[PDB]
Design a protein around this ligand. Structure first.
Ligand SMILES: [Ca+2]
Length: 432
């Protein structure tokens, strides 16, 4: 069965669109009028209240603050959501802090609150609707599609994909924010977001858990030129409660990444396992791409598809983190305890991070990579301190004869100390 809607063309319920193991429920996309896809425009000149624009009346686009010399970014919400939800306009607001842009929020709440299998068909219409607006901008406003970026969350990721496919992959970029898994995982390229849908496609996975039983709203497999897996793409810090928490983290990390690019470097790595075990640090020669808003600044962004990148974030409060590798050479007496290091630089000082916990043998090197909640800057000094999990009555003293700190850029800073301190005493090392 097919339904056809004016200039959006026709839509079928035949495979791979329905009746398959991936998309079992046979259904057709609802009427464009029941879905009522709306375009809410925000510009640097009207940041607080939107301007409504429609593709079928170019006069609306011309009487608005839409600016043909600025890039255009669309934001599409997903399942059960609304284009009028604060996260959309707020993301636009962060953008306005760092650039001049036409920020368009796509409201398709008319079709997002349907049942899943229905909302999944509805995005076919929403996607065609987005593609038509881009088509009119190209055609009537001489605005090139390469100046377009579409950000989509959940079903919105695949919506961006439909729009990109209908625009023949000419869209500048598509960012998938935890693209939905059900009805899309393992479907052909025409159904789901894939590298071919835009010139550059960057994906942030934050809830890749298996829906049944682990309710992982997003998909585990790679769908872009560069797929980022913050915190392994599974259990985001701070999401022990709240059902949509891990799912909504992708929006939060992207939102914060507009103001804090440096706080989210992604490390090329085969897996999170290897990353956690110090095998994907520091950044490669060309640097690490910045997850989020500026991932497009990466030199080799599209030279290959499904490039995986790992990194960790905090649990709230801008989520930003900076990774360092510290190597400690022990001195003093052999005890059993844990050694901690603190970093001091011109920007600030990190907290103390356990490097090793066990048998501290003299002249034995112990490395550990950690994620600092502060970028220290150019390192000035480093502080050591160890604890004995058994106070040996001999008052043993341990020291660090040498401490090497390697930054994400591969730069090593050496620190030396001729002293040894007893348990729980801060030893400050100096440059050497
Ligand atoms: Ca596709």
């Amino acid at each position: 069965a097919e339904v056809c809607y004016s200039h959006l063309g026709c839509f079928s319920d035949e495979k791979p669109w329905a009746g398959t193991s991936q998309r079992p429920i046979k259904s057709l996309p609802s009427d464009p009028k029941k879905i009522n896809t709306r375009f809410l425009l925000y510009t640097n000149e009207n940041q607080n209240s939107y301007q409504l624009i429609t593709a079928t009346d170019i006069a609306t686009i011309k009487a608005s603050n839409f600016n043909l010399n600025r890039k255009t970014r669309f934001i599409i919400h997903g399942f059960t959501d609304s284009g009028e939800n604060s996260w959309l306009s707020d993301m636009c607001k962060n953008m306005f802090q760092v650039e001049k842009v036409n920020c368009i929020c796509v409201d398709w709440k008319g079709g997002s609150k349907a049942q899943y299998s229905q909302a999944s068909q509805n995005i076919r219409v929403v996607g065609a609707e987005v593609a038509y607006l881009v088509q009119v901008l190209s055609t009537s406003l001489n605005y090139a599609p390469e100046n377009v970026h579409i950000i989509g969350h959940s079903l919105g990721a695949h919506t961006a994909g439909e729009a990109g496919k209908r625009l023949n992959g000419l869209v500048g970029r598509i960012t998938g924010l935890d693209p939905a898994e059900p009805y899309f995982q393992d479907t052909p390229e025409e159904v789901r977001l894939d590298p071919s849908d835009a010139k550059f496609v960057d994906v942030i996975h934050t809830d890749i858990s298996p829906i049944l039983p682990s309710l992982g709203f997003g998909m585990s497999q790679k769908v872009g030129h560069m797929d980022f897996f913050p915190n392994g793409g599974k259990d985001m810090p701070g999401c022990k409660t709240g059902i949509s928490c891990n799912h909504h983290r992708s929006i939060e990390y992207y939102h914060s990444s507009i103001l804090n690019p440096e706080g989210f470097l992604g490390y090329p790595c085969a897996s999170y396992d290897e990353f956690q075990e110090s095998g994907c640090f520091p950044c490669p020669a060309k640097g690490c791409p910045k997850m989020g808003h500026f991932a497009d600044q990466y030199p080799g962004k599209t030279n290959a598809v499904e490039q995986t990148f790992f990194l960790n974030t905090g649990a709230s409060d801008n989520f930003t983190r900076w990774r360092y590798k510290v190597s400690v050479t022990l001195s003093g007496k052999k005890v059993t305890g844990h050694i901690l290091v603190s970093l001091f630089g011109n920007k600030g000082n990190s907290k103390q991070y356990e490097i090793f916990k066990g048998t501290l043998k003299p002249d034995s090197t112990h490395s550990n990579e950690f994620d600092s909640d502060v970028d220290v800057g150019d390192l000035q000094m480093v502080k050591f301190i160890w604890y004995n999990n058994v106070i040996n009555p001999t008052l043993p003293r341990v020291g660090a004869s040498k401490i090497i700190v390697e930054t994400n850029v591969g730069k090593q800073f050496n620190f030396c100390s001729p002293e040894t301190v007893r348990e729980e005493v801060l030893l400050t090392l100096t440059p050497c």
